Design a protein around this nucleic acid. Structure first.
Ligand SMILES: [Mg+2]
Ligand SMILES: [Mg+2]
Ligand SMILES: [Mg+2]
Ligand SMILES: [Mg+2]
Ligand SMILES: [Mg+2]
Ligand SMILES: [Mg+2]
Ligand SMILES: [Mg+2]
Ligand SMILES: [Mg+2]
Ligand SMILES: [Mg+2]
Ligand SMILES: [Mg+2]
Ligand SMILES: [Mg+2]
Ligand SMILES: [Zn+2]
Lengths: 82, 127, 100, 151, 99, 114, 211, 224
RNA sequence: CCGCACAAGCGGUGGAGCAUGUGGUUUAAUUCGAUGCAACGCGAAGAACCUUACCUGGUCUUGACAUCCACGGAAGUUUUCAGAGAUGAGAAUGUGCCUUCGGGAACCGUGAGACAGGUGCUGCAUGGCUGUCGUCAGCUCGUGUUGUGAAAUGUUGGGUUAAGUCCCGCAACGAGCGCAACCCUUAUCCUUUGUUGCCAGCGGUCCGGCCGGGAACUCAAAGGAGACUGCCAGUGAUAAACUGGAGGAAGGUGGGGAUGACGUCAAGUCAUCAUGGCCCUUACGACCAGGGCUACACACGUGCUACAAUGGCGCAUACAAAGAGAAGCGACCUCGCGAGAGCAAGCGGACCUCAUAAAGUGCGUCGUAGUCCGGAUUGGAGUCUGCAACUCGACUCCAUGAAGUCGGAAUCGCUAGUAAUCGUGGAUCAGAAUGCCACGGUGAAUACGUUCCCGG
């Protein structure tokens, strides 16, 4: 899916926010606009809100979730049948 | 005497050359049968020479370029006939009745707008 | 169309130009393998920072005469309409209708 | 042809025998404009004809055709505004053509695991005046006669 | 040691004139020409929708045919190369000079 | 002639009867046949049992058919358990690789419903 | 149905182009864009001059342009001061040394631009379009134009509907590439609405090609 | 022409008694074999008095139009006009040949333009098929206006053969006041002919007699 | 009377899966239009961001963009914090040129409001452009004649053409818009010119068109010549016209395009552009992040791949044209199974490259089966483009092996190098082709006729 020469794309400022949380220990889920940045090992057992485009939804990350994009977890549409 | 020929059919062109001697065919430095994996094409080049039955009288150094196997052969036959008319000087009447000097034109039609093929019509759904 | 959009394009272009060098060498570092994998890591991270509009991908062909996003002719950079017109007048040197 | 009948392309003869009915015939068996794929199958029949059914396959070529070449034909026509299925003759060329269709179709309905084998068999089959091509000559020679209410 | 020269244009008449004028001037300067060799002219076809309103049938086709000639002189001297620089040609034509 | 998963699928060319087993496809089977050194077209029936023994080995070396299905099941299982986008779709039984759901999604959609 | 452009079709047969300069794929797009700009600037300057044609040929280094107009003395001004500053503005707006020449047309009626624009103007004088166009065709026939055709479309006299109409004089053949036909469109923005005008002028068939 | 000169040619011959016109009774000698016989006693003096007027017109520089559309006598009338340097119509009469003089003049100009153009050149510039087509158009214009290309204006006198056949011409002439000289068979209506010659109009011999006598007197009137 | 209109033929649609548009549905948004022909793989010659107008939120109010006059600062260059970025916040360097010294140029920023802006509504206010009937054969006028005149004639009739094509008849004759022809291309040949193109002859050659050379022929591309029922025979009203034959490379407008007579349908487009008028104007104007344009109970249109032995598979093996290309093609060689990667020359292109065309042909294979058919879908694992690929890119490898066993009603397309097939390139494009636009390979069958289906 992505070239493994440079590795999984993550946002710098997300690294900043997450690492600050970490060194500061647990903080209420910080908010995020970058659905795209890839989950990392440092981001484990912590929650974060992510703009589904109308609003940021809180997702609580876990070990396996690492190596995937944060956005996949957030649904950008709704549907309930017909 | 080497006899020059220029036969063209479809998108192939063919220079042709005839030398009196034991009958032989050398096209693009290949040998006819070795050139064509199809029999019809060997027969098509032989057909003008076969009709006059002077195959044993003239050998053939020939060259063909462009087009596909059928155009190649057609153009070659055309060039053969022109060389035969040049050498005999009386074969023009025989070739004209035979039908080998026709050339035939028939270049493939150019695709035209709004048409999946130069004449094919996209399906028009009435209903 | 919207002079707003036209100016947006002009800006995107002019801006994304100057960083050509930086942008370039940045990829080079990143693309270039045999690196320590940190020099790149930060390097790609650094590149991320630049004005998102820096990417040539951000740019969008737009008819010069009308600022039209579709119907762009790289050979002229114009709208299929306007190129037809300019042709009909004979501006385009040598351009004539094609029949074959 | 509402103005003038436009002639069908005039054909040239097979070289393997200088014959043409082959040529017109192979043109029938031909699929997707591939001449090489078609001619292979006739020789996978006529050759096996000259031996399985007896020499002179080129004469067996038509003994079936003879067994199939239709005579009576029904060109249903609304002459009075109502479709009349009137039995009618057809010039020789057609019945040859028709027959040729009438056999090739039968070489597509026999399985046998190969197309070459099917053409060989049906040919001989109808070459003995027995099978389908002759049958679809029979039935047409049957329903043509069955509807003879009015000219 | 050569002086080869490629001429490009949109109208053969101009390109023919340019070549004619360059071979003849070479004869005046005592330059030996390789002749005005014609070369495959480049045809560029453009398909273009002709209607602002939505349709696929409305279309037009235009062409740019780039006529192309080649000349060359085997033995140049000041008198030959300088004369080519002195020569002034029309706009629509293109002059490329190589030794 | 037992092999991983199905035993004696059919009397066909080694590479064919080989690919017959789930998790064994044209390439894995041809590579196993080359690794065994057994001939490509020799029928699995009538093949030496000693040769068949080399096969049980070279195949059990791979994930076997029964094991493979379990593991892919677990993969998809997680994929769903994470409630992830494709996780959801899988649960919804809808195309999970951006295939358009507007029309022609029947392959996974199933029979037409009013 | 929709007619074709008489000028375009007869290009390279009886109608020479408006810009000759050679070019390559890389510079062709900029060269036409700059050519469009000078024409746009020049036509506005020559609006007072009532220019009929503006040709632009770029030599390999220099750019040259020639103007055809009914008012040579207006373009000359005094010692070419106007056209001098014009040569300046164009040389710069095109980033090339510019050479400006004038070849005034001696038959203003026999040019579709001059006539078309005169019509547009007179319409802006709100004169009776009908008599206007009719006077123009008579003047062209007096000048010997083999044939003339004119057309005014949309809001004729601020009509609350578009009474588009056309008038034909003498012979104006189309579909014959042998025929020399000057053509031109023009517009007039009346307070009620925008009205288009087309003009054809057939001056006789040419023989022997573009020459 | 003397009565004996006419009679040998057969001028007395006429149409059938079944087919005659009412006003012709004074000019009819009688009937034989159900055939109308024309009276030469009237024919000769009227023809002479018409020749007097024709000589007068030609002696004041008159332009004379010989008119006849008979397929037999077309060449006779054409040669008759050529023998006296005059103008003729020998092919089917076209309505408005006189009243519509302007359109005929434009057609005369087109005939003149085509012949001049072929001599000047530019036929080579045209495709060979087109040049042949232009020659065919020039030939068609000649077959239509060979006689009147050089008439210049409306003629001063008309000579008509079989006035009933050419009735449109005489109606035009009367509408213009141009005098009509006509050979009038018994089946014709003589009202339109100001100098009427009652005589056979089909027979080649009598027609040639009329034409030759008229042309001799026309050349005489020209000579002065 | 005529037209793939019908008829005779092939190949299809309608079944299957998928691509693709549209309606419905849902959505926060799923932006706007097109709606039988003449919408529905349409605009769009290419939505990840951008694109973009839709939604969510963040923001600005003479402004994103333009002119205006002030006030100041060179212009710039570099650089740090917060922010999601919009942006603020800074913090350094430079702070330049002409000047007649005033300033000016130059830009930058702050103020003033005049003003900017609109993809806001009105194609029933319009221009401009296009679709259609329809390349359908028609539409008319000058003169003339007749009619007091509204008018008619011409254009009518008969032969007869692709044609109101042409002739004969004919109070009609001429002409125009037209038709035709002139244009491009292709079909033959000739002249000129011969490199990067060719090698007939040869001398050489390592044996390669490769090199002495050749300038023959192929090609190349400018000029030319050639098809006119000309010619002949036979019909026909003796005219036009037709038919056949010969010659001829081509024969009866030689094949193919471009060209659309009026006029029609308030056709379509005020989101190409222009524009009448109306409305917003701290906002219907401007910027930014995310989402959306890809949604699915659904329904229709268009397209693609199939259902298999003319097949599939493997092995070897062959004949092309037309093109694109220097922020480009990217050779060669090395690495990898591939996606690719590395290396890196040559090429602005008769020079290099993309690129070695498939169907075919030769050999073995399978032996009729849901198969060694078909390939969907899904898991796993990667490659690449682009800051960035999750929604939502393309491609590779491993595995999975659907549905589908030729598809009712009904229906559509084509008369020859046509349809059918199989490859090839281009546009659009950072990337994103079953879509379009072109190029070649191989290459059918039928058309009795016009009763009829429709159309005129
Ligand atoms: Mg883009
Ligand atoms: Mg709207
Ligand atoms: Mg609409
Ligand atoms: Mg409307
Ligand atoms: Mg967004
Ligand atoms: Mg969409
Ligand atoms: Mg479809
Ligand atoms: Mg297969
Ligand atoms: Mg089956
Ligand atoms: Mg398409
Ligand atoms: Mg093709
Ligand atoms: Zn009489």
């Amino acid at each position: 899916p992505r070239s493994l020469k440079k590795g999984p794309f993550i946002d710098l400022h997300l690294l900043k926010k997450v690492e600050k949380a970490v060194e500061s220990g647990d903080k209420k889920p910080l908010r995020t606009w970058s659905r795209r940045s890839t989950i990392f090992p440092n981001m484990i057992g912590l929650t974060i809100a992510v703009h589904n485009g109308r609003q940021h939804v809180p997702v609580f990350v876990t070990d396996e979730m690492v190596g995937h994009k944060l956005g996949e977890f957030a649904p950008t549409r709704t549907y309930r049948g017909h | 005497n080497q006899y020059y020929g220029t036969g063209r059919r479809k998108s192939s062109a063919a220079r042709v050359f005839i030398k009196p001697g034991n009958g032989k065919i050398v096209i693009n430095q290949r040998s006819l049968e070795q050139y064509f994996g199809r029999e019809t094409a060997r027969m098509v080049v032989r057909q003008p020479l076969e009709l006059v039955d002077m195959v044993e009288k003239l050998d053939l150094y020939i060259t063909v370029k462009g087009g596909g196997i059928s155009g190649q052969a057609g153009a070659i036959r055309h060039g053969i006939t022109r060389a035969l008319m040049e050498y005999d000087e009386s074969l023009r009447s025989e070739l004209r009745k035979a039908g080998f000097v026709t050339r035939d034109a028939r270049q493939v039609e150019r695709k035209k707008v709004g048409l999946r093929k130069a004449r094919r019509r996209p399906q028009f759904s009435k209903r | 169309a919207k002079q707003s959009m036209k100016a947006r394009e002009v800006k995107r272009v002019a801006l994304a130009d100057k960083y050509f060098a930086k942008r370039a060498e940045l990829k080079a570092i990143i693309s270039d393998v045999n690196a320590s994998d940190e020099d790149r890591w930060n390097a790609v991270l650094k590149l991320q920072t630049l004005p998102r509009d820096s990417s040539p991908s951000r740019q969008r062909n737009r008819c010069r005469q009308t600022g039209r996003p579709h119907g762009f002719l790289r050979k002229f950079g114009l709208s299929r309409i306007k190129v037809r017109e300019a042709a009909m007048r004979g501006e385009i040197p040598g351009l004539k209708k094609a029949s074959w | 042809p509402r103005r003038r009948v436009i002639g069908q392309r005039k054909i040239l003869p097979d070289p393997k025998f200088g014959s043409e009915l082959l040529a017109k015939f192979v043109n029938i068996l031909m699929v997707d404009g591939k001449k090489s794929t078609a001619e292979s199958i006739v020789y996978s029949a006529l050759e096996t004809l000259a031996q399985r059914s007896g020499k002179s396959e080129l004469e067996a070529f038509e003994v079936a055709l003879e067994n199939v070449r239709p005579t009576v034909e029904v060109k249903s026509r609304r002459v009075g505004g109502s479709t009349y299925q009137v039995p009618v003759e057809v010039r020789p060329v057609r019945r040859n053509a028709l027959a040729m269709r009438w056999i090739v179709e039968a070489a597509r309905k026999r399985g046998d695991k190969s197309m070459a084998l099917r053409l060989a068999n049906e040919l001989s089959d109808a070459a003995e005046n027995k099978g389908t091509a002759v049958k679809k000559r029979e039935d047409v020679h049957r329903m043509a006669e069955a509807n003879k209410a009015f000219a | 040691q050569r002086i080869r020269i490629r001429l490009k244009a949109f109208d053969h008449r101009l390109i023919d004139q340019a070549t004619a004028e360059i071979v003849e001037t070479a004869k005046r300067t005592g330059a030996q020409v390789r002749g005005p060799i014609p070369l495959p002219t480049r045809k560029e076809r453009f398909t273009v929708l002709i209607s602002p309103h939505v349709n696929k049938d409305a279309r037009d086709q235009y062409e740019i045919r780039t006529h192309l000639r080649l000349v060359d002189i085997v033995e140049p001297t000041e008198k030959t190369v300088d004369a080519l620089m002195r020569l002034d040609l029309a706009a629509g034509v293109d002059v490329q000079i190589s030794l | 002639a037992r092999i991983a998963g199905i035993n004696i699928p059919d009397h066909k060319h080694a590479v064919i009867a080989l690919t017959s087993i789930y998790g064994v496809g044209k390439t894995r089977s041809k590579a196993i046949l080359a690794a065994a050194g057994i001939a490509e077209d020799v029928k699995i029936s009538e093949l030496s049992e000693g040769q068949i023994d080399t096969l049980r080995d070279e195949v059990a070396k791979f994930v076997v058919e029964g094991d493979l299905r379990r593991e892919i099941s677990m993969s998809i299982k997680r994929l769903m358990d994470l409630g992830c986008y494709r996780g959801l779709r899988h649960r919804r039984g809808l195309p999970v690789r951006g295939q358009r759901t507007k029309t022609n999604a029947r392959t996974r959609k199933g029979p037409r419903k009013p | 149905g929709q007619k074709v452009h008489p000028n375009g079709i007869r290009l390279g047969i009886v109608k020479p182009w408006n810009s000759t300069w050679f070019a390559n794929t890389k510079e062709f797009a900029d060269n036409l864009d700059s050519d469009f700009k000078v024409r746009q600037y020049l036509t506005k300057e020559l609006a007072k001059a009532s220019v009929s044609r503006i040709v632009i040929e770029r030599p390999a280094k220099s750019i040259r342009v020639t103007i055809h107009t009914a008012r040579p003395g207006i373009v000359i001004g005094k010692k070419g001061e106007d056209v001098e500053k014009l040569r300046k503005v164009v040389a710069d707006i095109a980033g090339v040394p510019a050479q400006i020449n004038i070849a005034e047309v001696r038959k203003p009626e026999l040019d579709a631009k001059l006539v078309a624009d005169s019509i547009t103007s007179q319409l802006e004088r709100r004169v009776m379009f009908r008599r206007a166009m009719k006077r123009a065709v008579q003047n062209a026939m007096r000048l010997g134009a083999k044939g003339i055709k004119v057309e005014v479309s949309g809001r004729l006299g601020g009509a609350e509907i578009a009474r588009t109409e056309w008038y034909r004089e003498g012979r104006v053949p189309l579909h014959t590439l042998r025929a020399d036909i000057d053509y031109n469109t023009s517009e007039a923005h009346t307070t009620y609405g925008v009205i288009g005008v087309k003009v054809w002028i057939f001056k006789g068939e040419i023989l022997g090609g573009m020459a | 022409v003397s009565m004996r000169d006419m009679l040998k040619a057969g001028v007395h011959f006429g149409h059938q008694t079944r087919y005659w016109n009412p006003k012709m009774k004074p000019f009819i000698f009688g009937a034989r074999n159900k055939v109308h016989i024309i009276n030469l006693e009237k024919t000769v003096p009227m023809f002479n008095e018409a020749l007097a007027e024709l000589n007068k017109i030609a002696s004041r520089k008159g332009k004379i139009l010989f008119v006849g559309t008979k397929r037999a006598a077309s060449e006779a009338v054409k040669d008759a006009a050529l023998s006296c340097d005059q103008f003729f119509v020998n092919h089917r009469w076209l309505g408005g040949m006189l009243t519509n003089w302007k359109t005929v003049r434009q057609s005369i100009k087109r005939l003149k333009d085509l012949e001049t153009q072929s001599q000047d050149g530019t036929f080579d510039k045209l495709t060979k098929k087109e040049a042949l087509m232009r020659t065919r158009e020039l030939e068609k214009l000649e077959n239509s206006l060979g006689g009147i290309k050089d008439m210049g204006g409306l003629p001063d006198a008309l000579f008509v053969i079989d006035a009933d056949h050419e009735h449109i011409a005489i109606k035009e002439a009367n509408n213009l006041g141009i005098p009509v000289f006509a050979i009038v068979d018994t089946n014709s209506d003589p009202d339109g002919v100001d100098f009427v010659i009652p005589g056979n109009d089909d027979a080649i011999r009598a027609v040639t007699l009329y034409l030759g006598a008229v042309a001799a007197t026309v050349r005489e009137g020209r000579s002065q």
